[PDB]
Write a protein that binds this ligand. Structure first.
Ligand SMILES: [Zn+2]
Ligand SMILES: [Zn+2]
Length: 52
């Protein structure tokens, strides 16, 4: 079943669960999955398997 990634405003340093690097930026720094909690960069969403 699919991740339901929604863009997210991270308020503490949070890292990408796919590539490990910081979700850089001030706002809108990546996407969180509603259902499993996975955090990804915009550039990393295509790279993650679509299995929630
Ligand atoms: Zn998920
Ligand atoms: Zn990443």
């Amino acid at each position: 079943m699919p991740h339901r990634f929604k863009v997210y405003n991270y308020m503490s340093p949070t890292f990408c669960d796919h590539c490990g690097s910081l979700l850089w930026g001030l706002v809108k720094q990546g996407l969180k999955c509603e259902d499993c909690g996975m955090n990804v960069h915009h550039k990393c969403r295509e790279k993650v398997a679509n299995l929630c």
